[PDB]
Design an enzyme around this catalytic site. Structure first.
Site, PDB file in Angstrom:
ATOM      1  N   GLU A  70     -12.003  24.542 -14.776  1.00 12.38           N
ATOM      2  CA  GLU A  70     -12.065  24.792 -16.212  1.00 12.38           C
ATOM      3  C   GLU A  70     -11.882  23.500 -17.002  1.00 12.38           C
ATOM      4  O   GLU A  70     -12.584  23.270 -17.995  1.00 12.38           O
ATOM      5  CB  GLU A  70     -11.014  25.833 -16.598  1.00 12.38           C
TER       6      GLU A  70
ATOM      7  N   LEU B  82      -8.684  23.636 -12.209  1.00 16.67           N
ATOM      8  CA  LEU B  82      -9.296  22.321 -12.378  1.00 16.67           C
ATOM      9  C   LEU B  82     -10.753  22.438 -12.811  1.00 16.67           C
ATOM     10  O   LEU B  82     -11.240  21.624 -13.606  1.00 16.67           O
ATOM     11  CB  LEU B  82      -9.185  21.509 -11.083  1.00 16.67           C
TER      12      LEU B  82
ATOM     13  N   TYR C 265       0.826  -1.201   0.000  1.00 17.16           N
ATOM     14  CA  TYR C 265       0.000   0.000   0.000  1.00 17.16           C
ATOM     15  C   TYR C 265       0.862   1.255   0.000  1.00 17.16           C
ATOM     16  O   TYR C 265       0.515   2.256  -0.638  1.00 17.16           O
ATOM     17  CB  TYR C 265      -0.931  -0.002   1.211  1.00 17.16           C
TER      18      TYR C 265
HETATM   19  N1  LIG Z   1      -4.406   1.983  -2.909  1.00 20.63           N
HETATM   20  C1  LIG Z   1      -4.763   1.630  -1.674  1.00 20.63           C
HETATM   21  N2  LIG Z   1      -5.824   0.771  -1.490  1.00 20.63           N
HETATM   22  C2  LIG Z   1      -6.191   0.411  -0.237  1.00 20.63           C
HETATM   23  C3  LIG Z   1      -5.509   0.886   0.869  1.00 20.63           C
HETATM   24  N3  LIG Z   1      -6.086   0.363   1.972  1.00 20.63           N
HETATM   25  C4  LIG Z   1      -7.116  -0.426   1.593  1.00 20.63           C
HETATM   26  N4  LIG Z   1      -7.179  -0.418   0.224  1.00 20.63           N
HETATM   27  C5  LIG Z   1      -8.167  -1.106  -0.618  1.00 20.63           C
HETATM   28  O1  LIG Z   1      -9.437  -0.812  -0.068  1.00 20.63           O
HETATM   29  C6  LIG Z   1     -10.291  -1.940  -0.165  1.00 20.63           C
HETATM   30  C7  LIG Z   1     -10.712  -2.325   1.247  1.00 20.63           C
HETATM   31  O2  LIG Z   1     -11.306  -1.196   1.850  1.00 20.63           O
HETATM   32  P1  LIG Z   1     -10.736  -0.435   3.143  1.00 20.63           P
HETATM   33  O3  LIG Z   1     -10.465   1.025   2.882  1.00 20.63           O
HETATM   34  O4  LIG Z   1      -9.497  -1.113   3.691  1.00 20.63           O
HETATM   35  O5  LIG Z   1     -11.948  -0.687   4.182  1.00 20.63           O
HETATM   36  P2  LIG Z   1     -12.630   0.441   5.098  1.00 20.63           P
HETATM   37  O6  LIG Z   1     -12.991   1.668   4.283  1.00 20.63           O
HETATM   38  O7  LIG Z   1     -11.712   0.816   6.227  1.00 20.63           O
HETATM   39  O8  LIG Z   1     -13.997  -0.234   5.601  1.00 20.63           O
HETATM   40  P3  LIG Z   1     -14.102  -1.328   6.784  1.00 20.63           P
HETATM   41  O9  LIG Z   1     -12.727  -1.671   7.310  1.00 20.63           O
HETATM   42  O10 LIG Z   1     -14.820  -2.522   6.232  1.00 20.63           O
HETATM   43  O11 LIG Z   1     -14.923  -0.698   7.884  1.00 20.63           O
HETATM   44  C8  LIG Z   1      -9.488  -3.048  -0.827  1.00 20.63           C
HETATM   45  O12 LIG Z   1      -9.769  -3.023  -2.212  1.00 20.63           O
HETATM   46  C9  LIG Z   1      -8.058  -2.624  -0.594  1.00 20.63           C
HETATM   47  O13 LIG Z   1      -7.218  -3.092  -1.618  1.00 20.63           O
HETATM   48  C10 LIG Z   1      -4.438   1.751   0.692  1.00 20.63           C
HETATM   49  O14 LIG Z   1      -3.825   2.189   1.664  1.00 20.63           O
HETATM   50  N5  LIG Z   1      -4.070   2.116  -0.588  1.00 20.63           N
HETATM   51 MG   LIG Z   2     -10.535  32.881 -18.892  1.00 21.91          MG
END
Ligand SMILES: Nc1nc2c(ncn2[C@@H]2O[C@H](COP(=O)(O)OP(=O)(O)OP(=O)(O)O)[C@@H](O)[C@H]2O)c(=O)[nH]1
Ligand SMILES: [Mg+2]
Ligand SMILES: C=C(CC(=O)OC)C(=O)N[C@@H](c1ccccc1)[C@@H](O)C(=O)O[C@H]1C[C@@]2(O)[C@@H](OC(=O)c3ccccc3)[C@@H]3[C@]4(OC(C)=O)CO[C@@H]4C[C@H](O)[C@@]3(C)C(=O)[C@H](O)C(=C1C)C2(C)C
Ligand SMILES: Nc1nc2c(ncn2[C@@H]2O[C@H](COP(=O)(O)OP(=O)(O)O)[C@@H](O)[C@H]2O)c(=O)[nH]1
Ligand SMILES: [Mg+2]
Lengths: 440, 426
Positions: free
Chosen positions: A254, A252, A224
């Protein structure tokens, strides 16, 4: 005046927010304690960076941001991290129990207990703005909080701030880093519920970022942290027009005028270059022509899809660094002769160009080389509906058996909300087909 | 004392307006502080037309600066001649217009329009005999286009017997900021057809082509375009600013140039235009031939695709008046096909002894040609290509407009095109 409030929801939204605000501080010369020795306007000002940072009388530059998550461990790392002094405790909001990868828990069962507090904190930030322009909302599609709580928040923001613009950075799920089987459910539910409340959404396909990190940065198994540092460069390119000023700087909003032809068709495809390791950049200076050419390589897109198999409705080029219009025009002329760029018959074929002169920067210890010039292309192509089609197909496979649906019904949701959401996605896919058919 | 009140609105309007005031201040001997330091009484004889005289023999432009965002007017105030403008004549908001005619005309612009009318009223009340107004703006954006035409309508309501004149920059996809420019321009053109007496049609496509093809500027900027416009604006207002017999005021100009009320859209031109040769002396035959060449005209319309209803030509500098007549009657008699036969002696010539700063001789062209329909045809085509699919309309319906208003604007400009074609065949 012209302030922007950022809202980071759930783990993905919070961790990406950590990367973005760290990068913003480096770009603006803001120290981890919030001090900015170049800002001679103590306690205020109307500089371009003041769109994202307020200022205290003690000289601290404070992000106009709220971090919200339904469990505390991710935001707790912000509270004790390197940039803890940047935020005041009231900007970091946590519950005790998360949404368990369940949209219904983030939107209803657990989200309802914290939504009023979150709105109160957002209101506190809005009250400090002399001319609030809108919100930037960072969240995953797949998490229960990122999907369910975001849609609840977006619904409530439309009521409390009418038509004030709300833009999204949305993390589209990838099996290589996914944590839940039900992420297709959560993605369709939040896309349906947020669709009428969002003015513009930049989708970020985790698989596309994953592949770019592996291919271009020689990272065997991106984390991540690897993904988020690349994502923050793309976010920074998009918001650079709001945080810096110049004579070739195009706002942005625009670009947004050209990018959104119909309210529902508001999902630009982002492409970023150059993504290069320090060992490879040490030889090459990549020219304006080289980075511009890379914007039309599908391997550099933030969402996996084939624009050669769609039609364009808009094409925007956002340059930063050592770039002059003469070199941009020559690069664009080369691209049009050699590349597959077909527009719909009802929109102009030109490219809209903005140049921001401050060069990009990188966080120390990262994998991206520091370059003299970079570019983010924002295009409105019908091909981005391919991303919806992949999600809609995984949804259909599971929902035909009602697999895992009992988890949502158990939290008060009805089967009708699933089919209503899926039908909205079907109409959205058909909308993308319709806009791309020639006139008569 | 026949005063003109000047208004500049929006980004394009204020940038071109600022350069116009820089140019004519130098011609009249006014420094950035408002003090006169010239060496000729001809500079002061009609200076009242554009400048008020304040305490201490200082000259303040009778100019009002309008915008819905502060950016451009901050840069004007911090510019070369930024301190010459009356500080109370800066009228600006903060929200901007988002390249949206509806925001300039109906929502954001309506909140600010009364404050501009207060400053217009203040300047008009201090006029011995106000003759009219000149507005600088673009048609492709939101403030100059939408709020500019709103201002014109409200000014006409309060001063119905005064002349309204505009310098209107027409958009082109080659020099374009946003795709909605044909929408904003089509809505604005209908306002101009009803509420202006004379409109100089400045096409950004023509300005770019002149900079690139003629001036050999590989990468023209908006500053390069505005340099051509300010030189042109100085030329076409020479008759108003210096002693002369022909078109000496806005109303006599309109009576000479406008045979039918709606056909008041002029193609301007300027000579010389050459690459940097530059010190080479220019002769009267060369000025005349260049001034009538399509490459020197700023509306991107071919005059040989139409016919001249009326023409005004202004020569500046010390030259042979007899020679001016010979070449002017030469081009007229040799190309009589392109002048309508039913308006006798429709080409009028004026000469002003004072030339611009860097030239010994120059010529400015003002043509009322039926070939201007090509400009309106281009806008109508670009309008229809999007409106057929209702593309980008949500930006406007979100401000309260209905699709019927777009349909009516489309019909109005097509009617204007048909009117020009009627007289082109006549
Ligand atoms: N690019 C990126 N994707 C992330 C990251 N953390 C989680 N994800 C993605 O987010 C999705 C999972 O959702 P999360 O954001 O971890 O879950 P949440 O919003 O905290 O919701 P809950 O934990 O279920 O309450 C998966 O597809 C992960 O691959 C991150 O730090 N960077
Ligand atoms: Mg202008
Ligand atoms: C105050 C200014 C701005 C300025 O320039 O001050 C910084 C001004 O422009 N005033 C003038 C003026 C003219 C008409 C009516 C009222 C005023 C004038 O009196 C003057 O100074 O012209 C300037 C203008 C020039 O730039 C230049 O044009 C450009 O390259 C250019 C580029 C983009 C757009 C437009 C031009 C200019 C031309 O344009 C002109 C106008 O003549 C072009 O073909 C014309 C023939 C000129 O021989 C040639 C080639 C010159 O080489 C000349 O040496 C020179 C003069 C005489 C400059 C190099 C300095
Ligand atoms: N010639 C010229 N055209 C301009 C300039 N600035 C903007 N434009 C044109 O004006 C249109 C955009 O309108 P603009 O004046 O920026 O919007 P506004 O501030 O809302 O009135 C587009 O057609 C641009 O090509 C300028 O400085 N010079
Ligand atoms: Mg979580």
């Amino acid at each position: 005046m012209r302030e922007c409030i950022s809202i980071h929801v759930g783990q993905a939204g919070v961790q990406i927010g950590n990367a973005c605000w760290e990068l913003y501080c480096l770009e603006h010369g803001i120290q981890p304690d919030g001090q900015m020795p170049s800002d001679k306007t103590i306690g205020g000002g109307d500089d371009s960076f003041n769109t994202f940072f307020s200022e205290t009388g003690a000289g601290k530059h404070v992000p106009r941001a709220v971090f919200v998550d339904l469990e505390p461990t991710v935001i707790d790392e912000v509270r004790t991290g390197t940039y803890r002094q940047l935020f005041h405790p009231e900007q970091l909001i946590t519950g005790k129990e998360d949404a368990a990868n369940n949209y219904a828990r983030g939107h209803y069962t657990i989200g309802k207990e914290i939504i009023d507090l979150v709105l109160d904190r957002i209101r506190k930030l809005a009250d400090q703005c002399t001319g609030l322009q809108g919100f930037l909302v960072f969240h995953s599609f797949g998490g229960g909080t990122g999907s369910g709580f975001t849609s609840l928040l977006m619904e409530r923001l439309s009521v409390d701030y009418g038509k004030k613009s709300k833009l999204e950075f949305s993390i589209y799920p990838a099996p290589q880093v996914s944590t839940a089987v039900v992420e297709p459910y959560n993605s369709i539910l939040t896309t349906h519920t947020t669709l009428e409340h969002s003015d513009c959404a930049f989708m970020v396909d985790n698989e596309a970022i994953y592949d770019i990190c592996r291919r271009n940065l020689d990272i065997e198994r991106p984390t991540y942290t690897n993904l988020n540092r690349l994502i923050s460069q793309i976010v920074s390119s998009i918001t650079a027009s709001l945080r810096f000023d110049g004579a070739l700087n195009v706002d942005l909003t625009e670009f947004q005028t050209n990018l959104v032809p119909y309210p529902r068709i508001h999902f630009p495809l982002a492409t970023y270059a150059p993504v290069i390791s320090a060992e490879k950049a040490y030889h090459e200076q990549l020219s304006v022509a080289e980075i511009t050419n890379a914007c039309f390589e599908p391997a550099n897109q933030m969402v996996k899809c084939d624009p050669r198999h769609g039609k364009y409705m808009a094409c925007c080029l956002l340059y930063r660094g050592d770039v002059v219009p003469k070199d941009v025009n020559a690069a664009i002329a080369t691209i049009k002769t050699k590349r597959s760029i077909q527009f719909v018959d009802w929109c102009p074929t030109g490219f809209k160009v903005g140049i921001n002169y401050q060069p990009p920067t990188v966080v120390p210890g990262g994998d991206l080389a520091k370059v003299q010039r970079a570019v983010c292309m924002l295009s409105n192509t019908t091909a981005i509906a391919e991303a919806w089609a992949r999600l809609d197909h995984k949804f259909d496979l599971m929902y035909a058996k009602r697999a895992f649906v009992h988890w949502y019904v158990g939290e008060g949701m009805e089967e009708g909300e699933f089919s209503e959401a899926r039908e909205d996605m079907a109409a959205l896919e058909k909308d993308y087909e319709e806009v791309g058919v020639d006139s008569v | 004392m026949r005063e003109i009140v000047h208004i500049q609105a929006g980004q394009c309007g204020n940038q071109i307006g600022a350069k116009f005031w820089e140019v004519i201040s130098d011609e009249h001997g006014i420094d950035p502080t408002g003090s006169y330091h010239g060496d000729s009484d001809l500079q002061l004889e009609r200076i009242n037309v554009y400048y008020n005289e304040a305490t201490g023999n200082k000259y303040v432009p009778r100019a009002i600066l309008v915008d819905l965002e502060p950016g451009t007017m901050d840069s004007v105030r911090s510019g070369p001649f930024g301190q010459i403008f009356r500080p109370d004549n800066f009228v600006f908001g903060q929200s901007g217009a988002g390249n949206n005619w509806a925001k300039g005309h109906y929502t954001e612009g309506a909140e600010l329009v009364d404050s501009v009318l207060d400053v217009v009223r203040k300047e008009s009340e201090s006029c011995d005999c106000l003759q009219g107004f000149q507005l600088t703006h673009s048609l492709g954006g939101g403030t100059g286009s939408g709020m500019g035409t709103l201002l014109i309508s409200k000014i006409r309501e309060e001063y119905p017997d005064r002349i309204m004149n505009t310098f209107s920059v027409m958009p082109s996809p080659k020099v374009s900021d946003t795709v909605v420019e044909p929408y904003n321009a089509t809505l604005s053109v209908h306002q101009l057809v009803e509420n202006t007496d004379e409109t100089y049609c400045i096409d950004n496509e023509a300005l770019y082509d002149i900079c690139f093809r003629t001036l050999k500027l590989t990468t023209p900027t908006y500053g390069d375009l505005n340099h051509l416009v300010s030189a042109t604006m100085s030329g076409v207002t020479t008759c108003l600013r210096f002693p002369g017999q022909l078109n000496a005021d806005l109303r006599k100009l309109a009576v000479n140039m406008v045979p039918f009320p709606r056909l008041h859209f002029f193609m301007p031109g300027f000579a010389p235009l050459t690459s940097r040769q530059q010190y080479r002396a220019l002769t009267v035959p060369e000025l005349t031939q260049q001034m009538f060449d399509s490459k020197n005209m700023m509306a991107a319309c071919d005059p040989r695709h139409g016919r001249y209803l009326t023409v005004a030509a202004i020569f500046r500098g010390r030259m042979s008046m007899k020679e001016v007549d010979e070449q002017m009657l030469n081009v007229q008699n040799k190309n009589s096909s392109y002048f309508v036969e039913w308006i006798p002696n429709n080409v009028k010539t004026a000469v002003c002894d004072i030339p611009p700063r860097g030239l010994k001789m120059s010529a400015t062209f003002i043509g009322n040609s039926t070939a201007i329909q090509e400009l309106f045809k281009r806008i109508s085509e670009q309008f229809t290509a999007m409106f057929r699919r209702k593309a980008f309309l949500h930006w406007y319906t979100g401000e309260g407009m209905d699709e019927m208003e777009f349909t009516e604007a489309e019909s109005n400009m097509n009617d204007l095109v048909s009117e020009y074609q009627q007289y082109q065949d006549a």
